[PDB]
Amino acid sequence: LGTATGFDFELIDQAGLGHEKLTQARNQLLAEAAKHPDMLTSVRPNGL
Amino acid sequence: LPAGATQERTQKVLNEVTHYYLTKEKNNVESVFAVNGFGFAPRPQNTGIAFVSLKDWADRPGEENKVEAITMRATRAFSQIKDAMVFAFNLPAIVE
Amino acid sequence: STEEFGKILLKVNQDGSRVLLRDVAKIELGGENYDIIAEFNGQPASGLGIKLATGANALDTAAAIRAELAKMEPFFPSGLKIVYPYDTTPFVKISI
Amino acid sequence: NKFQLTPVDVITAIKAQNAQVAAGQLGGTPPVKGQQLNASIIAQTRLTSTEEFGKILLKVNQDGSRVLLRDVAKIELGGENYDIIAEFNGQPASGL
Amino acid sequence: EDTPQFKIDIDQEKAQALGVSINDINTTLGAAWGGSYVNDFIDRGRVKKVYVMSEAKYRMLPDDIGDWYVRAADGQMVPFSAFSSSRWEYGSPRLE
Amino acid sequence: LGKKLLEAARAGRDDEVRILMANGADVNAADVVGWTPLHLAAYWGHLEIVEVLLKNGADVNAYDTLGSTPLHLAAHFGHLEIVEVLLKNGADVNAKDDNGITPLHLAANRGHLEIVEVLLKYGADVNAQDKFGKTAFDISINNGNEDLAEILQ
Amino acid sequence: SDLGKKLLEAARAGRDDEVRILMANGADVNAADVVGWTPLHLAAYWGHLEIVEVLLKNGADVNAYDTLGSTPLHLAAHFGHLEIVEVLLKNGADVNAKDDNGITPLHLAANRGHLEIVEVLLKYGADVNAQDKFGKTAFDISINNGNEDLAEILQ
Amino acid sequence: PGADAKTVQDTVTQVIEQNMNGIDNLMYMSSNSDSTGTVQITLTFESGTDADIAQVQVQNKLQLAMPLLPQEVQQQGVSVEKSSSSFLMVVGVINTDGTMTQEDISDYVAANMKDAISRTSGVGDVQLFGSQYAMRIWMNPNEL
Amino acid sequence: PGADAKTVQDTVTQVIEQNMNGIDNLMYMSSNSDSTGTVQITLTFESGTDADIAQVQVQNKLQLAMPLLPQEVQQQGVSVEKSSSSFLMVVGVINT
Amino acid sequence: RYNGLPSMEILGQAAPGKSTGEAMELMEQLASKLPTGVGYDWTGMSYQ
């Protein structure tokens, strides 16, 4: 079940961008989510 | 086409089939998707298939503008093509 | 890349000179096979010939395919477009 | 022992001389545009008789005299195993 | 229907005499004229196949067979014409 | 027209072969591999067509793009009547394909003893060697055909 | 140090405003991980120009070498970061710096076909005849790669 | 790859066919061996047969034949599918700006579209009208 | 054994993922390739799917890919199991 | 990888007093302003 009010999001490389570009895009999304503490809490990568 | 016939010969015949539907059947045929080296399964060089989509039934009034009459006229026109078994067919009610 | 395959070292000659793969072969990014060539109303095209799994619903499967294609469209290169040249499901929907 | 051979030499010979080789095509895809000839290349096929297996060439001696498989072995059609023998009322028989 | 096919016979004695392995003959013929799936590579993040094959222009004509050289144990390059013979025959392009 | 003759010869359509040559179809018309109507009749063993083609001035020594003549095909596939008809119409009994293989070499390899005797009778060279230096006798010994080996001394 | 390790993560991540605060608090600019990579190494690799400039202003070793002898200019040149290559060379980066393999920034730039960087390195006095452990020059690399543009520049 | 009709039949088709036994509710079995280097063996089952079990049973018998098959045939992949013979639909892909060739579109469809459509529930078989790109080493005999 | 994340992904994970076709009631598919020398592909199915039919269909399609995996991976074996994250108990065994 | 494409899993939760649906809506908004060829999807608890 996980946590209630908790979400499970997948960022997908749809055009053979590669690992490096998808990381930069992930960092870009995580940075913007951190500017909305009013709405989003503990938005983090599940991976390494 | 008979086995031994080249990919170029099959495209030549597929062009004639595509030409017919785009020119002689403007009012009935919407699109033609022709594939070289394919029948019901892959079969390089001597085999081709054409998927024909007609315009809406409303825009095709009368019996002569329906699939049966269209495929009859098509098969008759394509009978003239040399060294090629070319026929249009409406896939049945129960195809099986 | 072709460049990397091109500089594959086959042998070093007795005088120290190198024989690369590009010295004995043309290296290009081409098809697994060259058997199947498709056209849409005369234009260069590819596509997917989809067959219904035994006992599966045609309309539900068609809907599930369109849902999956809808996911892909936003990430297409410039100009690439999906066309619907052959579908047996519209008639089922409309006839019913 | 007389011809200085082992079962390894016999097995190697059978594999090389009882082979079914895929040898490709003349004018296969992708062709040079304008190719007329499209023919399958037929190399080695499986041996079909004891006579063909018998004349499998194992080696040629220094004096040009040839050692065939039939010179070091008996060749005949015989059971995969000789383990199961049936009789119907004392009469030689097989069954399922 | 049955079609003309290019029957080629590898002379085992002559190949043995010149020191040319039958595995090298079969691989050279198959790879060049039929194509050979070697291994996989990564094209823009996706696993895809690597194929070796003759450039179209060297697998179009019957006489091109003799342009393909196999290296013997002694290191001498041997043309296919040295250890092979060919003739035209008829066979099935599709056995049911 | 020459295309319809090749197909008619292959299929064994006796009547069709005559009708096409009554309209003056090329008797020496060659397909992509260089096979004449006489080649196809010799291969598929259509005796009646071989006779009809030859009397209409068919090249008896026509050779394909690998040097094989109709006598090569008839001798190889055991068509005795066709081998006899061909040889009587001045077919080269010692004819060599690009590999140096002769009608005797082929007939010998498949063990057609009746045809071997006909070829020998029409002046076939028993010592004729292919590109690998093999005679019809060398083939008879290798195949283990003891009946054939005796005929070839 | 605590801050030294925080600066490594900041320089890598490209967190300009965090690096700004760390430089003010005096986070060790000569801080190094197990492989011997300084904050400047990381910034040069990941291509963070402003942090490269800020670190060099705060007395970072421009010729800091990892445990295999690679400098920030090696990383900048190899991964096509033109602006960082220029900034490094202006702050006295050794243009002819050899790693443990004898590989120079010119070798790495040539191998990846970075034409602009090659011309910048050649301008700052990159030894065009410099050989690695395999006796290979940047020219030998250009010929082997089949880079006709680069092969011309190095002639 | 590069096999004639007889080579395919006598090294693949016959080997698989001889292993097709202990299969419930089988009406008949038909196969083609083409000079395109292709075989297709269709096993037709009694009406009301579970298509899941039918596939499982055919697949169970195929795995016994797999090690006997040539290594080149194994590496091409031997698929077992439970679908209609006819097409449900054709999804055509074109470039309206004419910036991509027939080969470019075929590769994109193969690399970006085909897989997801093939895994969709109800899709028994997906045929690419074209080829996925491969690294093509076009050999020259004169230079070799 | 001794494989990095990319080696696992590009020689195992991508090959298996491409062959997970024609399986019924698949909602989504996820995978991890890591430098412990490990891949785990989780296929999640529609609620009410027979878990045995889901497993056998995945397992069967994995054999489509098994000959395309590295010899070292074929040797270790590729486990297909019904996923469960609930243990009845953990029995610990210690030496005092 | 997610559905055969390179992916990166991101976990997070709706802030105190906010619903999971609202937190998901913002994540979709933020995700639609990422570089070209970067898609997204909902998995696990978020999917169902």
Residue numbers in the entry:
A (entry chain B): 674 to 721
B (entry chain A): 578 to 673
C (entry chain A): 242 to 337
D (entry chain C): 194 to 289
E (entry chain A): 722 to 817
F (entry chain E): 14 to 166
G (entry chain D): 12 to 166
H (entry chain A): 50 to 193
What does the article say, verbatim?
The E. coli AcrAB-TolC drug efflux pump contains the inner membrane H+/drug antiporter AcrB comprising three functionally interdependent protomers, cycling consecutively through the loose (L), tight (T) and open (O) state during cooperative catalysis. AcrB is the homotrimeric IM proton-motive force-driven H+/drug antiporter component which recognizes and actively transports multiple drugs (antibiotics, detergents, dyes, and solvents) via the tightly connected AcrA and TolC channels across the OM, leading to an observable resistance phenotype. Four different entry channels (CH1–CH4) have been described with putative entrances from the periplasm or the outer leaflet of the IM toward the two drug-binding pockets, the access pocket (AP) and deep binding pocket (DBP) inside the AcrB pump. Here, we present 13 X-ray structures of AcrB in intermediate states of the transport cycle.
In an attempt to prevent ansamycin binding, we made the switch loop more rigid by Gly619 and/or Gly621 to Pro substitutions. Most peculiar, under FUA-only co-crystallization conditions leading to binding of FUA only to the TM1/TM2 groove, high FUA concentrations (4 or 5 mM) were mandatory.
